[PDB]
Design a protein around this ligand. Structure first.
Ligand SMILES: N[C@@H](CCC(=O)N[C@@H](CS)C(=O)NCC(=O)O)C(=O)O
Ligand SMILES: N[C@@H](CCC(=O)N[C@@H](CS)C(=O)NCC(=O)O)C(=O)O
Lengths: 236, 220
């Protein structure tokens, strides 16, 4: 299993799934190292945890990299995603990653952890707000999402991998009942996520896709509480 | 003005970007939009519209020559500092101020020490890789420096002056870095027009009072 590329994260989707996709889709051999949370207090102050004792981390041919956003940009540079692009075009692609990570992936995770991080919170009041913000942000991304192909043009770049996982994150939270509503509000992002799921070089990644979004002890419990709430009316 | 930064008249997501523009040899309009992807901050730079705080930081890093002569691993160390400082510290400080408006019904006495605790631990990890002299950029400041210094000011803003002594004790090199940044001559005008509130909260003053009444210095 001894790879010169190593991506380290927990056995969950949260902050790293897009990064897994970028590496698999470039047909790089890499070790998808999934560190269990029970074993993580051992890795915090070791090399796997990196300078800041947090995940994800990447090792790329001897070079250690930390933090999801920095890794994304490092990979974009390393895979040629910015070749022939001026700073303005690059910044547009980095805005997409940044928006998907900050406003969607971290927020979906916060919604799942909301009880344990905000004791006594009224889910029925708090969720519609935070969720409504989250959909509003994706709604604006959708307005600049191309009808065909990728943010990267004829080929996918980091923005594409993050945008597709932002849709899967949202779909995971809502459940399959509400696919029709998503397709109505986010048609171009939905279609892009579908295209990404069909890429042959991602077949193994889909095959080994992690089941949960965070390491929440009972995430299934939290979801059914979240899905009891009227989130569909927020979309429409 | 060919360069315009648009944000609210508050610190939150933009002060570090104001500092990067001011510290460079550059005229820019600091456009401050009354508190009343359709989101801010935005930057216009010689005809180019840029959005999202992190992407603006990286755009300026490229434009201002911050990454010249650095390999990709080096660039990514700097970019991770910006990302830690903004997403794990500055954004979370904002979250604490908005906490009971966004999480109606929350018990602050249990919630805050935990979230404030995580936030401090992150900065303490960075403290260990902060230089004793100079900047993350070496001889001159880069974006990492501006964000790191605003992360400290954010924390200080939240605690209050009483607990300054304990901060230096926990985070000497970041405290020194932030101090050094404040005395850069090129930033004097920025400090002169420095906004007085961190967020666009309806009544932040009142919210601060509530937060400081909790046992916050215990977290250090
Ligand atoms: N056509 C399907 C759902 C289509 C759909 O909504 N697909 C999007 C969600 S916006 C998606 O999940 N894409 C990933 C995939 O289907 O592979 C149905 O009849 O319910
Ligand atoms: N040491 C001074 C206080 C200055 C101070 O607060 N220094 C650090 C504490 S972390 C700081 O935040 N400096 C940033 C600044 O000068 O704006 C005093 O007590 O008279």
């Amino acid at each position: 299993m001894n790879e010169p590329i190593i991506l380290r994260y927990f056995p969950v989707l949260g902050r790293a799934q897009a990064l897994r996709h970028a590496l698999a889709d470039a047909e790089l051999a890499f070790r998808d190292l999934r560190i269990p949370l029970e074993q993580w207090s051992q890795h915090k102050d070791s090399d796997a945890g990196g300078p800041y004792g947090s995940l994800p981390t990447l090792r790329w041919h001897g070079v250690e990299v930390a933090e999801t956003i920095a890794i994304a940009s490092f990979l974009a540079r390393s895979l040629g995603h910015y070749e022939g692009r001026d700073n303005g075009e690059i910044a547009r692609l980095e805005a997409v990653v940044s928006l998907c990570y900050t406003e969607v992936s971290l927020q979906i995770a916060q919604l799942l952890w909301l009880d344990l991080f905000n004791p006594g919170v009224d889910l029925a009041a708090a969720v519609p707000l935070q969720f409504g913000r989250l959909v509003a942000r994706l709604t604006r991304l959708e307005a600049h999402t191309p009808e065909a192909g990728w943010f990267g043009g004829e080929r996918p770049v980091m923005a594409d991998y993050f945008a597709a996982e932002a849709i899967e994150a949202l779909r995971y939270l809502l459940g399959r009942e509400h696919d029709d509503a998503l397709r109505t509000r986010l048609p171009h992002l939905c279609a892009l996520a579908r295209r990404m799921a069909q890429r042959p070089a991602l077949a193994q990644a889909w095959s080994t896709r992690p089941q949960t979004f965070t390491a929440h002890p009972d995430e299934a419990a939290m979801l059914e509480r979240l899905r009891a709430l009227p989130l569909a009316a927020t979309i429409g």
